[PDB]
Design a protein around this ligand. Structure first.
Ligand code: SC4
Lengths: 272, 68, 262, 235, 235, 68, 60
């Protein structure tokens, strides 16, 4: 996040040192600066790379999900936690193979009457319950699971500033894997083809669990719908192994492609 | 437990406060026990790109012949 | 000089008189797990010279029409001597590698091969079903696979191939191939060098993992400038791949694993 | 309690704010880190790595491996350009999709020097001298070697060192340029010509390819994070 | 008053927050404590106590005192397993309801070593050698003593010391495993075989039981508090 | 009356603030007279499980025979 | 190597201690002691057959 070096003045040359010539076969990039190939003046550099630090690049709340609940089973909804339901944050994360950070979740809740001239309801309170992989998932908008004696819940009152909570680095590995070239199972010799088969590039069937959202108020016959837009921001970021960015449209959770396979336009070789 | 850092002043007001004093510092205090609750300090460091730009075993000088 | 080298590992030695230096991926040389980064508590096995030696996989042939080749590690070495034995007898395994690609021609030949080492080299499949490639197809072993010039969707619903369909300019994963240079690599330009040498440390989000379930590195070779000779529309030059595992240590010994095949 | 006064901006949600919030999973035993190779601290590190340029976007070559290959031949000397490009790293179709261009599309401003490296993939028996040029904006885009030679240029002699780098110095009026095609912040023209000609003996291929690479210099910086147009989502 | 700005998260109720609040019964004279025996500081203390495993969940034995009894006999040596188990402490039906399994079901992750102790309840005149085994995941689950003997194992000789403990070391790829049946974090197999055979003289019972116990080692830990599926409430 | 404790930093930012200074400390002040109003400090200790794991009168060594 | 200067090539010279099947393919040979010879300026290549024996001396 710092300063750039100054340009030193450089005069003419006539020597056996040729920085302009190189050999990219080695796998290295030629570290030339302007003064290597032209005469330069002294410039005191004041520009910095403060905004392109790994932290500043991700320091934005991106939408990862839009959970919908109809307060007239739709009285409650469950969202399997992921960053792949949307494309924008996903593409930025995928510039790297591994990552490690904390997360900040902000929830923007909106609601409205479906009918322009019918129904009425008192102010709604929402419960956003996190169900860690293993915990019982709600079957009804009002069954015993909503007691949350151990699961973390967030109760949001409609109209209040967006709710917000922080989550630590929760991975079971030392870093989050954006790419996993493997399987969760190894098919063994002799077992039925139905056996030992698993998805390519998938780890746990339930990585991070899911969110169960519901309106706590008793539902009125009035037609109402609410939407909880989930925004996530990685804070305290560290990333490893850069990768080229996604060039064609995403086709699922994997690196699969199908449709926009011809991303580049035509342009004449000798056309400026 | 307050942390006092200085800001990098961009646009300067016609004040001496825009050039010195606590007027170009900002104060921070953590209220939560879990580090996850903390904001980002944003006083982030940089590093050498060499691991990517020149992952070569036998180090070479730009003035000198790459293929030797 | 930058051009002459000799690599000795165990009972195997490789010599070259036309190198273009060597690349050490991310500037990290392979190493063993430190006590501060250790996870499994049992005493590891370290075959050393019996596993850390040069193994020559099958030779492929480069023609004017070739699109490219790919291999997965440790997969390509699963049947290689005592390295393969240790891989299958243990639940966990870790290793780094010295990849030496060989390709000689003459002063009247042209062509350039881009040799890339990719961590977590996930490839694209052939169906509309996501992540449908089956284990047997994803792990070809020493013979590896090939890149294609175009995407062709498998439509046989009765008998889906469940295979990869890596399109070359899309780097087999939906990214542009010209940007694959952000990964450790070397280029075998026929007018300059014979080979490419890459030293790969162990890369993963864990200190040790299952070698049968997970491939850490992928080796991709793409013809950047096609093979051409004098006036012989007909030209074929072999590309031999020699890889040596390094700092092998395995944990969790039990009965041998025999994976399902074909 | 302590008397307070709510100021405008209260209860809002700024997508770019930086505040503290309660932890939903308190006292969680976080898995410690390990030293994984290849860590990155700044996005500019990635912009400094050579990435191959898709120079040949002709209808038959675009979106194929041929878009990266620019063919040369042993024909008699000509003063016509081998290729032409505009210095619009984030918007020119040939630069916009390189690693450098991809990163620039997440920012609104860019400033600094760039360098273009060309690799000769002909046989060892082939020789030749080429002129790589850069003309700052404001005049007619060079169409002959005679005009190109009047600007910044490097005369590349082909031989043992297979590649040649031409640095495009930061010559600008504004302190930062925009990542969109805009005349006010236009950058100039890049072109290549034959200085002499490519010469090959008998029994040697008369046509060969050259590949181009682009990366940022150590004085390069970007600012004002924005959203890219390189990724979309329908429905 | 003092100018303030309300940040997002204001007026919400996080079920896991940790704030102060006014006391509804001020100046209350609290009854002082007494030193009651058996105080607990950490839930892991309970996971380290041996608890009997319901190993025999066959239809006639499950949910009876017989689910805890595994019967042996003086038959000639056989290479077939006496019992088989999967190392899924929170999900395997035989482990999920032990004190250890009960606690693990209130957490999402577990890591550490475990130990299985077996008690021989035959007569004093009975002798025998048994092989207790643990095979890390990835290969075929052992079905003969020949396969089991290739993994971690303890050869138990029956005599004065009635019990034998086999430690299942922490051998994992991930730093923590999940408390659900998931192949990615699978733990392996536990099995028992006859090394020689149980031998008894005349006038002595030819069949006897062994009881199994499970507890966590001192390097065991759990994280991410969650709700258990072991308790429900209808209406 | 402020209590300043340090946090156990999990994920580290690319800052020196993530490794030291008041930036890895958190501050606490009690506002109520009754201790019941206080939050939980969560700086909780552990103990020996022996009272449960080995409530034996005559102490025994694991290497040595239990039944002697 | 007594070919012309224009000739290139890589060869694998191997040594397999006794006891197994004599190598008949490069695949078997590569598992024993071997030197991969790259042809070029240095015209020759040496492969050392180390003393690997059970007895302290062998018979002629
Ligand atoms: C590589 O990029 C990643 C890695 C992990 C991720 O998710 C991990 C994750 C795990 C648990 C929770 C649970 O968080 C919550 C809690 Cl406790 C309470 C209330 C609401 C929420 Cl929301 C949320 C996210 C994401 Cl979104 C991107």
């Amino acid at each position: 996040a710092n300063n750039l070096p100054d340009t030193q003045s450089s005069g003419p040359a006539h020597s056996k040192e040729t920085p302009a010539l190189t050999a990219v076969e080695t796998g290295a990039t030629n570290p030339l600066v302007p003064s290597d190939t032209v005469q330069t003046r002294h410039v005191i550099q004041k520009r910095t790379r403060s905004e392109s630090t790994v932290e500043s690049f991700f320091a934005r709340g991106a939408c990862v999900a839009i959970i919908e609940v109809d307060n007239d089973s739709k009285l409650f909804s469950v969202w399997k936690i992921t960053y792949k339901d949307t494309v924008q944050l996903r593409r930025k994360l995928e510039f790297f193979t591994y990552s490690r950070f904390d997360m900040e979740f902000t929830f923007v809740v909106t609601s409205n009457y479906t009918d322009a001239n019918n129904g009425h309801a008192l102010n709604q309170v929402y419960q956003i319950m996190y169900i860690p992989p293993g915990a019982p998932i709600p079957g009804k908008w009002n069954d015993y699971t909503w007691q949350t004696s151990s699961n973390p819940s967030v109760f949001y009152t409609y109209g209040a500033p967006p709710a917000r909570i922080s989550v630590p680095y929760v991975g079971i590995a030392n870093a989050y894997s954006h790419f996993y070239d493997g399987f969760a199972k190894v098919p063994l010799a002799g077992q039925a083809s139905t056996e030992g088969d698993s998805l390519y590039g998938a780890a746990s069937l339930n990585d991070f669990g899911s969110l169960a959202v519901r309106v706590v108020n008793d539902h009125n016959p009035t037609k109402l719908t609410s939407k909880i837009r989930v925004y996530m921001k990685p804070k305290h970021v560290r990333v490893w192994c850069p990768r080229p960015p996604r060039a064609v449209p995403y086709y699922g959770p994997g690196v699969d492609y199908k449709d926009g396979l011809a991303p580049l336009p035509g342009k004449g070789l000798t056309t400026y | 437990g307050a942390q006092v850092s200085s800001q990098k002043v961009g646009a300067h007001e016609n004040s001496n406060r825009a050039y010195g004093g606590s007027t170009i510092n900002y104060t921070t205090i953590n209220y939560y026990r879990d580090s996850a609750s903390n904001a980002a300090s944003k006083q982030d460091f940089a590093q050498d790109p060499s691991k990517f730009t020149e992952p070569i075993k036998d180090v070479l000088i730009k003035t000198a012949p790459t293929l030797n | 000089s930058v051009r002459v080298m000799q690599l000795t590992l165990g009972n195997s030695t490789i010599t070259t008189q036309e190198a273009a230096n060597s690349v050490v991926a991310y500037g990290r040389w392979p190493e063993y797990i430190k006590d501060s980064e250790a996870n499994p508590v049992d005493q590891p096995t370290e075959p050393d010279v019996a596993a850390c030696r040069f193994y020559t996989l099958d030779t492929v042939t480069w023609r004017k029409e070739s699109r490219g080749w790919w291999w997965k590690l440790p997969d390509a070495l699963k049947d290689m001597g005592l390295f393969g034995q240790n891989m299958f007898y243990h639940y966990l395994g870790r290793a780094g590698y010295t990849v030496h690609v060989q390709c000689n021609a003459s002063k009247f030949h042209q062509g350039a091969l881009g040799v890339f080492a990719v961590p977590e080299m996930c490839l694209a499949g052939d169906s509309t079903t996501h992540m449908f490639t089956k284990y047997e197809n994803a792990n070809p072993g020493e013979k590896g696979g090939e890149f294609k010039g175009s995407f062709t969707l498998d439509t046989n619903a009765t008998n889906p191939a469940r295979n990869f369909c890596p399109v070359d300019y899309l780097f087999g994963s939906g990214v542009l191939a010209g940007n694959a240079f952000v990964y450790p690599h070397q280029i075998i330009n026929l007018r300059t060098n014979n080979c490419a040498t890459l030293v790969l440390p162990y890369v993963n989000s864990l200190s040790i993992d299952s070698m049968t379930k997970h491939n850490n590195w992928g080796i991709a070779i793409l013809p950047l400038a096609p093979l051409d000779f004098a006036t012989e529309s007909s030209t074929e030059i072999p590309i031999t791949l020699t890889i040596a595992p390094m700092c092998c240590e395995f944990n969790g010994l039990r009965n041998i694993t025999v994976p399902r095949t074909q | 309690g302590l008397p307070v006064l709510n100021t405008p901006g209260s209860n809002q949600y700024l997508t770019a704010d930086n505040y503290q919030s309660p932890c939903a999973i308190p006292e969680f035993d976080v898995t410690p880190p390990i030293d994984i190779p290849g860590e990155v601290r700044n996005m500019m590190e990635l912009a400094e790595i050579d990435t191959m340029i898709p120079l040949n976007l002709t209808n038959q070559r675009k979106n194929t491996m041929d878009m990266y290959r620019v063919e040369l031949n042993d024909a008699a000397h000509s003063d016509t350009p081998i290729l032409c490009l505009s210095l619009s790293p984030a918007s020119d179709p040939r630069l916009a999709h390189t690693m450098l261009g991809e990163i620039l599309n997440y920012y609104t401003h860019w400033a600094g020097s760039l360098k273009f490296t060309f690799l000769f993939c002909g046989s060892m028996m082939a020789t030749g001298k080429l002129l790589v040029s850069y003309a700052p904006p404001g005049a007619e885009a060079p169409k002959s070697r005679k005009e190109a030679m009047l600007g910044t240029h490097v005369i590349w002699d082909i031989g043992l060192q297979s590649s040649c780098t031409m640095v495009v110095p930061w010559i600008s009026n504004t302190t930062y340029r925009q990542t969109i095609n805009d005349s006010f912040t236009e950058g100039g023209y890049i072109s290549m010509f034959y200085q002499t000609r490519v010469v090959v003996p008998l029994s040697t291929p008369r046509k060969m390819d050259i590949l181009g690479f682009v990366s940022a210099c150590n004085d390069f910086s970007v600012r004002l994070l924005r959203d890219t147009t390189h990724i979309s989502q329908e429905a």
